[PDB]
Design an enzyme around this catalytic site. Sequence first.
Site, short mmCIF file in Angstrom:
data_model
loop_
_atom_site.label_atom_id
_atom_site.label_comp_id
_atom_site.label_asym_id
_atom_site.label_seq_id
_atom_site.Cartn_x
_atom_site.Cartn_y
_atom_site.Cartn_z
N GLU A 423 11.72 2.86 71.18
CA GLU A 423 11.58 1.53 70.59
C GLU A 423 12.69 0.58 71.08
O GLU A 423 12.94 -0.45 70.47
CB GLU A 423 11.56 1.60 69.06
CG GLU A 423 12.87 2.10 68.42
CD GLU A 423 12.79 2.23 66.90
OE1 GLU A 423 13.72 2.80 66.32
OE2 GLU A 423 11.80 1.78 66.28
N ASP A 622 8.60 -4.31 57.42
CA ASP A 622 9.99 -3.93 57.25
C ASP A 622 10.92 -4.66 58.22
O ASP A 622 10.55 -5.71 58.77
CB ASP A 622 10.16 -2.41 57.22
CG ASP A 622 10.08 -1.75 58.60
OD1 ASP A 622 9.79 -2.40 59.63
OD2 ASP A 622 10.35 -0.52 58.62
C1 LIG Z 1 8.25 2.14 58.33
C2 LIG Z 1 7.60 0.90 58.63
C3 LIG Z 1 7.70 0.23 59.93
C4 LIG Z 1 8.52 0.77 61.05
O1 LIG Z 1 9.81 1.06 60.78
C5 LIG Z 1 8.03 0.89 62.26
C6 LIG Z 1 8.94 1.10 63.55
O2 LIG Z 1 10.17 1.72 63.36
C7 LIG Z 1 8.85 0.14 64.79
O3 LIG Z 1 7.68 -0.29 65.08
O4 LIG Z 1 9.96 -0.16 65.34
C8 LIG Z 1 7.06 -0.96 60.16
C9 LIG Z 1 6.30 -1.54 59.24
C10 LIG Z 1 6.20 -0.91 58.01
N1 LIG Z 1 5.54 -1.27 56.95
C11 LIG Z 1 5.75 -0.23 55.90
C12 LIG Z 1 6.54 0.71 56.34
C13 LIG Z 1 6.89 0.35 57.72
MG LIG Z 2 11.73 0.84 64.47
#
Ligand SMILES: Cc1c(C(=O)/C=C(\O)C(=O)O)ccc2[nH]ccc12
Ligand SMILES: [Mg+2]
EC number: 2.3.3.9
Length: 713
Positions: A423, A622
Amino acid sequence: TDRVSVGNLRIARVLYDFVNNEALPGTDIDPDSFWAGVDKVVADLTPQNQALLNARDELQAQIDKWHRRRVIEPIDMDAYRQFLTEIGYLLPEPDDFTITTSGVDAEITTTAGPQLVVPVLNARFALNAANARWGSLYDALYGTDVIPETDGAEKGPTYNKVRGDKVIAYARKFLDDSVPLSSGSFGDATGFTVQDGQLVVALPDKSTGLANPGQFAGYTGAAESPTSVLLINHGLHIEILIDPESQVGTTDRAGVKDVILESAITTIMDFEDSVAAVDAADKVLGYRNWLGLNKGDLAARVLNRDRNYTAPGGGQFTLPGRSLMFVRNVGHLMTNDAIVDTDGSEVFEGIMDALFTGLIAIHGLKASDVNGPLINSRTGSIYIVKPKMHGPAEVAFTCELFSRVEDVLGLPQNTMKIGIMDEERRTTVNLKACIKAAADRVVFINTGFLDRTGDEIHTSMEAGPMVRKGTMKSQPWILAYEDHNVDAGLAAGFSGRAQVGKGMWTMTELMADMVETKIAQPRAGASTAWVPSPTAATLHALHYHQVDVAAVQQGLAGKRRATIEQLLTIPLAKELAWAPDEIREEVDNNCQSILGYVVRWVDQGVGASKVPDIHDVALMEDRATLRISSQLLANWLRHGVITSADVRASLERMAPLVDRQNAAYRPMAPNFDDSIAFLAAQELILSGAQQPNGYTEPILHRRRREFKARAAE
Ligand SMILES: Cc1c(C(=O)/C=C(\O)C(=O)O)ccc2[nH]ccc12
Ligand SMILES: [Mg+2]
């Protein structure tokens, strides 16, 4: 004053007591040597951790300067690539290799299915997540728009039979597609019996077996009048609950009450982007929840026991009633004053998390004295997701950290396994080397595409204006990034050994769209992908029944579908790409999203919650989405797409809208500059370009701590 001295460290008392009284007992680690180890590990690895962070900054400065000294907008890909190699950003790719990670549970090496991620600070969400290994398909269909709320089929105060019938029919079709009868349709079933170890299904004019009798895995109740039948398809279980006298069963031709799907095979308990933890008190609340989960005694509601079945032949067996748990630690960047040294300098939170969540995880390797004897990892591994790593040296460092922690904890080497988030761009273009640096510890790679998009914007911040946030998901760079990830995993022998995972679906209310579109992930060879709720996990499970992931992965073997050039394709906007109204919409979209998220982060310490965008679509977002939005506006501001007045006006315009959407909530309007949350949002945008790699944590942590200190007055 409220700290305990251990060597060079001053540990907050609330954390020290938590560890001594709750975490350590039952682990057979002497407290003296644990704390001595904490001090030693922190002292030994802090310098490397800092050097790594300074290296990011030096790289980013050079890149910024490369863009500023060039005028030719058609970026010369040949020269850019050579530049990245010269400065050590883009490293040589190693020879082919296969990962050697062992001691990993079946949920990871073999099963393909949804992976649920929840904030560990919220005890009830966490409990529901652990219990989400099994989920009601009928509830998932009835409660979401997968069954359209058309005329006659809307959900009211009570059961709507028209809607229920659509639910039932949807599930009959799923069953037909997943576990076909030899002849006829489940839609016409009148009953189920077990005869000489074979499942028999009665139709109106005949009886029939499964086209593949090996998909019959078991049952409960009397064979000649079962209370349920258990099927398996692509390694995932499906349970048909039979109860003619139930409220739904009574309307069903076979007396079927529900269909239960094995849903969230694994769960990630998150200490990073979905939680807000700025001090020792916040960390302890998280650690305590992680502790309760691993001891099996978390109660907010309790943890489920294992499920008992009768085998086709009539013997007895059990299936796990709980998701296998990972924990996501924070990354290499942030410090936290839960521990400070003798100078007052905060200790790196990543180092702390490895020590503490690793300590606590030891309990998950022992039988729960409580709702057990559920052992999280039967094979003796601890699963930690490490986010936000930039390149193979940072992966190496996490290895060394884990190795030193295992020593402090007295665990065998490589007990602590790593889920590598891909990421950050410097990880993406050096992915093979990253996997290699963890070849003995890696249990997944996953495309954290939201953070990846954030890093994309920040890395090329000085190159020019970027496309809109909504355009990003479909840019060439990201599609190549997604394919490259899968290709690297497969070539490193992940198939049968480690998870290849994809990202989060964030549109919690658009489940019909999720069911229609998220199937793309297992179709692309991902053995797992992220969902934000147990409901979403049950619906995403449908996709693994439609798609044979193992077969897809084997069909992909040896393919090389993304080039380094495609990966390095910066998402620059074309000349005159937007009209004035489109620019305004994007500004309003981002400002609303930022404000809606930040207000709950800063005022209420909530790290993930539902916030309706500029179309009222409720997103469960988030920190990663905040990273994107703030960086995108910072990029538009940097390049003259918008003015600082446009941003101000948009923030002031969306603020009362966000107060409305939250109507113990303190309003941001009309006294904007009296609101710490409003000022945080403004700061995230206006200082976005100067934040390290666009990370939002420094600002959020500072502002949240400011808010807490005010409330203390
Ligand atoms: C856990 C999380 C992420 C997330 O941290 C994804 C990744 O780490 C990323 O795409 O960088 C993104 C949106 C969300 N909505 C509820 C929980 C959640
Ligand atoms: Mg992330």
